[PDB]
Design a protein around this ligand. Structure first.
Ligand SMILES: O=C(O)CCC(=O)C(=O)O
Ligand SMILES: [Cl-]
Ligand SMILES: [Mg+2]
Length: 263
């Protein structure tokens, strides 16, 4: 399942994290370790998590990447990917993101869930997830691949924590009974203009499925989704570059809006 030595995992994690911490893009790691499997990549990502926990960061949630059947097929993968969210990733609705701490950030409109019951795989699917949802909450992610490379590389991206870097919760919380996630419309505005549109169904056909896929992915490593877990279910719209001076508002049908100022 794995081709990296443990020393390589540790060194890769340090190297990839350092790119984030030092705001310094690096070559995608699969160029130097072309044999890396997803298990290697997750070993690396999880070691990054450890490095963050070790210096006292709290891990406050999980995020999903590649939550598009089309994109999965394009990238030659059969499942989404996930990454973790550190406490300092969090930005208040309307808050400021300091781009000088970021490399080449993009924002995406997502819907997050907080669970109220444990979920696990393998074999988790939508039906298992429904009963476990406490509420949903509009969330914009700021993603920022630490790689200098143009073309998306799933295994490198995983090693780089699915490009996670900031997330902004906002809008209004709602129970599942109050929202239809498949038809929940989102409008992303940047500097006063509509730049992207999407509906919840853009996430796998049903954003809650993202949670189940997460459960099954975590099961591959003998982990699950504890109750109370905050999960960003995936990009509803295309990701949009942001730069200093940009202001963005993402409007969620019936859920208010999430905004952020970039400096
Ligand atoms: O580009 C993708 O869909 C996966 C990587 C990512 O950063 C994300 O979607 O959160
Ligand atoms: Cl910041
Ligand atoms: Mg995302």
């Amino acid at each position: 399942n794995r081709t990296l030595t443990r020393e390589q995992v540790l060194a890769l994690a340090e190297h990839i994290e350092n790119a984030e911490l030092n705001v310094h893009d690096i070559g995608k790691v699969t160029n130097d370790f072309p044999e890396m499997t997803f298990a290697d990549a997750y070993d690396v990502q999880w070691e990054i998590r450890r490095r963050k926990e070790a210096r006292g960061n709290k891990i406050v949630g999980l995020k999903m990447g590649l939550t598009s059947w089309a994109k999965m097929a394009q990238m030659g993968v059969e499942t989404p990917i996930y990454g973790f969210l550190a406490d300092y990733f969090s930005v208040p609705d309307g808050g400021v993101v300091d781009c000088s701490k970021l490399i080449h950030p993009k924002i995406e409109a997502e819907i997050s869930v907080v669970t109220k019951a444990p979920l696990h795989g393998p074999g988790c699917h939508l039906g298992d997830v429904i009963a476990a949802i406490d509420y949903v909450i509009p969330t914009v992610e700021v993603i920022d691949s630490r790689y200098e490379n143009f073309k998306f590389d799933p295994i490198s991206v995983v090693a780089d924590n699915a490009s996670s870097t900031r997330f902004i919760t906002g809008g209004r919380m709602a129970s599942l009974e109050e929202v239809d996630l498949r038809t929940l419309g989102v409008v992303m505005e940047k500097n006063g203009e509509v730049v992207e549109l999407g509906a919840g169904a853009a996430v796998l056909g049903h954003p809650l499925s993202s949670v189940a896929m997460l459960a099954n992915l975590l099961a591959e490593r003998g982990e699950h989704i504890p109750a109370g877990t905050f999960i960003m279910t995936g990009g509803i719209t295309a990701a949009v570059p942001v730069a200093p001076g940009d202001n963005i508002t993402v409007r969620y049908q019936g859920l208010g809006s999430v905004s952020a100022r970039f400096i």
